[PDB]
TrEMBL record:
<feature type="domain" description="Helicase C-terminal">
    <location>
        <begin position="170"/>
        <end position="337"/>
    </location>
</feature>
<comment type="function">
    <text>Required cofactor for the serine protease function of NS3. May have membrane-destabilizing activity and form viroporins.</text>
</comment>
<protein>
    <recommendedName>
        <fullName>Genome polyprotein</fullName>
    </recommendedName>
</protein>
<comment type="subunit">
    <text>Homodimer; in the endoplasmic reticulum and Golgi. Interacts with protein prM. Interacts with non-structural protein 1.</text>
</comment>
<feature type="domain" description="Helicase ATP-binding">
    <location>
        <begin position="12"/>
        <end position="160"/>
    </location>
</feature>
<comment type="function">
    <text>Regulates the ATPase activity of the NS3 helicase activity. NS4A allows NS3 helicase to conserve energy during unwinding. Plays a role in the inhibition of the host innate immune response. Interacts with host MAVS and thereby prevents the interaction between RIGI and MAVS. In turn, IFN-beta production is impaired. Interacts with host AUP1 which mediates induction of lipophagy in host cells and facilitates production of virus progeny particles.</text>
</comment>
<comment type="subunit">
    <text>Interacts (via N-terminus) with serine protease NS3.</text>
</comment>
């Protein structure tokens, strides 16, 4: 009645060590849908200890289903295939205890430029090139590409227009007057609330995917019936919503390490996104079946020197600390080597400081740069003194009101961290978490 052609045809040598397969599976295809289960089951058949890396908590679910029925361990008791987020795996790589000797590693959405993704990618490529494993990077925008308008499935109407930046009292029609299938990418959360409010005071109720709430409001994109989507950079990694068109002003904020007086991390004002990033934003459409009326409205042009972004040095701080049987430090994935020009091992710490470094990132929720400086200074995880003893220039304020901290010990102190990383206080939700850290309740 039927041929086993029910499940895809997985070429061979994609499991052959010393090889790195780049699956440029354009969006909407059978990427996680069918391609993965096929490859996974085939490995489980080939008796291969496997590792599956998901970019986000949400994408981890998209894979739990496509893999629902297969022997896999998530986040009996003797499975041979693991599945966790990028960050979780990289954290474990910093542990003094070696990870399993995976014969095959598959990374989903392998373009995410977060420090951890960059580190894991370096680790994986080093493993395949050593001959200890075979790797597979799954992404339509692989590191190195710069194509803002690449092939797609559904016809895309590419045309530039004047996308507003904030609240408007009049003008622009295609905005407040449309079908209701469009995604709007914005630079900051501060600005995302205005363009959002405006769409509310007009004639539409949309959803705001916050910087760190993608694992709550996303699910609602499936059908909570809305006209527009207001996200930030985060959507670019495993986000699927309802839309026939997308508004893309090609803007974003990005962490930068300054070096004037004290070294500090700033979030540089709204700047151009990367080409691959631009694609990713447009790729949210033109990936559907029969549809033909899917247009892309973009303002501004993209740039390619994302080199001053803190993530490259931060990914390096993680790699110099990766524990490897030989002791030879993992290099970065071939196409990303040229982003940082630092000596291999300039950031390697000693056993006890490395653990603190890890803890400050896992239990403290602090960015890589900040946790490294704190650990590098010999400070202990529990010792929060550094949160109040910085110079006068590091006092944090809301409107002009100096923020104070009620420690769980009873005192009321002014928030003045010794090292300043703006990622810890720009977004109110982040400031909240950090306050909890400074108070000693974490």
């Amino acid at each position: 009645m039927a041929s086993i052609e029910d499940n895809p045809e997985i070429e061979d040598d994609i499991f052959r060590k010393k090889r790195l397969t780049i699956m440029d599976l354009h969006p909407g295809a059978g990427k996680t849908k069918r391609y993965l289960p096929a490859i996974v089951r085939e490995a489980i058949k080939r008796g291969l200890r496997t590792l599956i890396l998901a970019p986000t908590r949400v994408v981890a679910a998209e894979m739990e289903e496509a893999l629902r029925g297969l022997p896999i361990r998530y986040q009996t008791g003797r499975e041979i295939v693991d599945l966790m987020c990028h960050a979780t795996f990289t954290m474990r790589l910093l542990s003094p205890i070696r990870v399993p000797n995976y014969n095959l590693i598959i990374m989903d959405e392998a373009h995410f430029t977060d420090p951890a993704s960059i580190a894991a990618r370096g680790y994986i490529s080093t493993r395949v090139e050593m001959g200890e494993a075979a790797g597979i990077f799954m992404t339509a925008t692989p590191p190195g590409s710069r194509d803002p308008f690449p092939q797609s499935n559904a016809p895309i109407m590419d045309e530039e227009r004047e996308i507003p930046e904030r609240s408007w009292n009049s003008g622009h029609e295609w905005v407040t007057d449309f079908k209701g299938k469009t995604v709007w990418f914005v630079p900051s959360i501060k600005a995302g609330n205005d363009i959002a409010a405006c769409l509310r005071k007009n004639g539409k109720k949309v959803i705001q995917l916050s910087r760190k709430t993608f694992d709550s409001e996303y699910i609602k994109t499936r059908t909570n019936d809305w006209d527009f989507v207001v996200t930030t950079d985060i959507s670019e990694m495993g986000a699927n919503f309802k839309a026939e068109r997308v508004i893309d002003p090609r803007r974003c904020m990005k962490p930068v390490i300054l070096t004037d007086g004290e070294e500090r991390v700033i979030l540089a004002g709204p700047m151009p996104v990367t080409h691959s990033s631009a694609a990713q934003r447009r790729g949210r459409v033109g990936r559907n079946p029969k549809n033909e009326n899917d247009q892309y409205i973009y303002m501004g042009e993209p740039l390619e020197n994302d080199e001053d972004c803190a993530h490259w040095k931060e990914a390096k701080m993680l790699l110099d600390n990766i524990n490897t049987p030989e002791g030879i430090i993992p290099s970065m994935f071939e196409p990303e080597r040229e982003k940082v020009d630092a000596i291999d091992g300039e950031y390697r710490l000693r056993g006890e400081a490395r653990k603190t470094f890890v803890d400050l990132m896992r239990r403290g929720d602090l960015p890589v740069w900040l946790a490294y400086r704190v650990a590098a200074e010999g400070i202990n995880y529990a010792d929060r003194r550094w949160c109040f003893d910085g110079v006068k220039n590091n006092q944090i304020l809301e409107e002009n009101v100096e923020v104070e901290i009620w420690t769980k010990e009873g005192e009321r102190k002014k928030l003045k961290p010794r090292w300043l990383d703006a990622r810890i206080y720009s977004d109110p939700l982040a400031l909240k978490e950090f306050k909890e850290f400074a108070a000693g309740r974490k």
